[PDB]
Design an enzyme around this catalytic site. Structure first.
Site, PDB file in Angstrom:
ATOM      1  CB  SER A 116      -0.883  -0.067   1.034  1.00 24.91           C
ATOM      2  OG  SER A 116      -2.067   0.823   1.191  1.00 24.91           O
ATOM      3  CG  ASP A 233      -6.440  -2.179  -4.188  1.00 24.25           C
ATOM      4  OD1 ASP A 233      -7.156  -1.625  -3.535  1.00 24.25           O
ATOM      5  OD2 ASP A 233      -5.131  -3.221  -4.253  1.00 24.25           O
ATOM      6  CG  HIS A 263      -5.737  -2.784  -0.422  1.00 27.90           C
ATOM      7  ND1 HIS A 263      -4.265  -1.990  -1.810  1.00 27.90           N
ATOM      8  CD2 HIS A 263      -5.343  -1.801   1.292  1.00 27.90           C
ATOM      9  CE1 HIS A 263      -3.959  -1.458  -0.722  1.00 27.90           C
ATOM     10  NE2 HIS A 263      -3.737  -1.627   0.186  1.00 27.90           N
TER      11      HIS A 263
HETATM   12  C1  LIG Z   1      -3.065  -0.399   5.562  1.00 24.67           C
HETATM   13  C2  LIG Z   1      -2.757   0.071   4.159  1.00 24.67           C
HETATM   14  C3  LIG Z   1      -3.344   0.786   3.459  1.00 24.67           C
HETATM   15  F1  LIG Z   1      -3.791   1.491   3.932  1.00 24.67           F
HETATM   16  F2  LIG Z   1      -4.150  -0.037   3.304  1.00 24.67           F
HETATM   17  C4  LIG Z   1      -2.962   1.751   2.261  1.00 24.67           C
HETATM   18  O1  LIG Z   1      -1.543   1.916   2.721  1.00 24.67           O
HETATM   19  C5  LIG Z   1      -3.656   2.456   1.532  1.00 24.67           C
HETATM   20  S1  LIG Z   1      -3.277   3.934   1.031  1.00 24.67           S
HETATM   21  O2  LIG Z   1      -1.733   4.159   0.278  1.00 24.67           O
HETATM   22  C6  LIG Z   1      -4.316   5.109   0.870  1.00 24.67           C
HETATM   23  C7  LIG Z   1      -4.620   4.377  -0.721  1.00 24.67           C
HETATM   24  C8  LIG Z   1      -5.418   5.454  -1.247  1.00 24.67           C
HETATM   25  C9  LIG Z   1      -6.046   6.104  -0.388  1.00 24.67           C
HETATM   26  C10 LIG Z   1      -7.364   6.474  -1.129  1.00 24.67           C
HETATM   27  O3  LIG Z   1      -8.633   5.913  -1.391  1.00 24.67           O
HETATM   28  N1  LIG Z   1      -7.082   7.496  -2.020  1.00 24.67           N
HETATM   29  C11 LIG Z   1      -8.467   8.346  -2.667  1.00 24.67           C
HETATM   30  C12 LIG Z   1      -8.735   9.544  -2.257  1.00 24.67           C
HETATM   31  N2  LIG Z   1      -7.105  10.677  -1.893  1.00 24.67           N
HETATM   32  C13 LIG Z   1      -7.979  12.040  -2.790  1.00 24.67           C
HETATM   33  C14 LIG Z   1      -8.812  12.579  -3.420  1.00 24.67           C
HETATM   34  C15 LIG Z   1      -8.720  13.724  -4.124  1.00 24.67           C
HETATM   35  C16 LIG Z   1      -8.352  14.243  -2.923  1.00 24.67           C
HETATM   36  C17 LIG Z   1      -7.310  13.988  -1.314  1.00 24.67           C
HETATM   37 CL1  LIG Z   1      -6.577  14.947  -0.587  1.00 24.67          CL
HETATM   38  C18 LIG Z   1      -7.017  12.717  -1.514  1.00 24.67           C
HETATM   39  C19 LIG Z   1      -6.550   9.932  -1.849  1.00 24.67           C
HETATM   40  C20 LIG Z   1      -6.637   9.756  -0.044  1.00 24.67           C
HETATM   41  C21 LIG Z   1      -5.691   8.322  -1.859  1.00 24.67           C
HETATM   42  C22 LIG Z   1      -4.798   8.544  -3.382  1.00 24.67           C
HETATM   43  C23 LIG Z   1      -5.942   5.608   0.280  1.00 24.67           C
HETATM   44  C24 LIG Z   1      -4.895   5.704   1.046  1.00 24.67           C
HETATM   45 CL2  LIG Z   1      -4.896   5.525   2.595  1.00 24.67          CL
END
Ligand SMILES: CCC(F)(F)C(=O)C[S@@](=O)c1ccc(C(=O)N2CCN(c3cccc(Cl)c3)[C@@H](C)[C@@H]2C)cc1Cl
Length: 289
Positions: A116, A233, A263
């Site tokens: 992640s 995912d 995921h």
């Molecule tokens: C348990 C391990 C784990 F937590 F699963 C990982 O490390 C996942 S971590 O890589 C992660 C990846 C993606 C997202 C997520 O859904 N988004 C979509 C929305 N994004 C976003 C959108 C608009 C504006 C902004 Cl500011 C951001 C971010 C918050 C992020 C890119 C969330 C996360 Cl927490």
């Protein structure tokens, strides 16, 4: 006496102090004999190093010395929860721990394993030191966001918002997207070291920074890797795994897709989890023989 966020003194625990004077909790799984190689485990957002116990014991069984820490703002490490001044802090701290372990085990190859957000950390770490790492194991690394989650309009609103209220929270995570295995979702939801609170917009901005930086890093990336990705995912979009396979320069790159998997592939349905362990075991065994 400096204490973990759960009030345990750091003097009772394995730790390191990073360049900002913050204590990071460390974890080690060392074989009885001379290790064949070193491997750093890089956890994801809101989790911690103790979630890798079973993968680490498997890697130690291959006579690797496995080591990890809780990233700043995570687990038993110091820092405001799930906040970082800039994403590169995580990379810097990985490199501190890697350099400490190499000093103690000179000449041994060093691998990275990242999941992640920890996979984005691993990629950026390897791209900062091309030639340095023997290999990388990536489990659903952050390369591309879910395109719905991260439209131009949601990202431009989120930058405007972050300039005013960097501490505003999104909603709690839907932990149901992490795994089809309901017992593993229950384990995650009751782990006192996990942060499942809303993400702050400033930390969401740091994850968009990671995505940007990973894209610019891919043409520098030459390290051997194994990439494991679920097709369903909702956090690290499967299109990111294809992008990493297309744009990395690595001569040794392998992708396995898990059809229908969510995921957390190493805590998925037992058929997926057993395959993930087996594939990591064979890939690391081949490259430490
Ligand atoms: C348990 C391990 C784990 F937590 F699963 C990982 O490390 C996942 S971590 O890589 C992660 C990846 C993606 C997202 C997520 O859904 N988004 C979509 C929305 N994004 C976003 C959108 C608009 C504006 C902004 Cl500011 C951001 C971010 C918050 C992020 C890119 C969330 C996360 Cl927490």
């Amino acid at each position: 006496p400096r204490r973990t966020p759960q009030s345990i003194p750091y003097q009772d625990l394995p730790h390191l102090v990073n360049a900002d004077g913050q204590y990071l909790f460390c974890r080690y799984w060392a074989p009885t004999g001379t290790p064949k190689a070193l491997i750093f485990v890089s956890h994801g957002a809101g989790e911690h190093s103790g979630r890798y116990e079973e993968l680490a014991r498997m890697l130690m069984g291959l006579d690797l010395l496995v080591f990890a820490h809780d990233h700043v703002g995570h687990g038993q490490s110091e820092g405001e929860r799930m906040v970082v001044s800039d994403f590169h802090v995580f990379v810097r701290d990985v490199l501190q721990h890697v350099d400490s372990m190499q000093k103690d085990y000179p000449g041994l190859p060093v691998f990275l394993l990242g999941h992640s957000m920890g996979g984005a950390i691993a990629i950026l770490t390897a791209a900062e030191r091309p030639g340095h790492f023997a290999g990388m194991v990536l489990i659903s690394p952050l390369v591309l966001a879910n395109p719905e989650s991260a439209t131009t309009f949601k990202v431009l609103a989120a930058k405007v918002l972050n300039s005013v209220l960097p501490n505003l929270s999104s909603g709690p995570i839907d932990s149901s997207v992490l795994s089809r295995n309901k017992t593993e979702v229950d384990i995650y939801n009751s782990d006192p070291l996990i942060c499942r609170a809303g993400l702050k917009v400033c930390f969401g901005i740091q994850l968009l920074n990671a995505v940007s930086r990973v894209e610019r890093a891919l043409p520098k990336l030459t390290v051997p890797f194994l990439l494991l990705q679920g097709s369903a995912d909702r956090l690290c979009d499967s299109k990111g795994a294809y992008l990493l396979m297309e744009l990395a320069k690595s001569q040794d790159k392998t992708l396995k897709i898990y059809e229908g998997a969510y995921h957390v592939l190493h805590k998925e349905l037992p058929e997926v989890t057993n395959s993930v362990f087996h594939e990591i075991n064979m890939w690391v065994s081949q490259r430490t023989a």
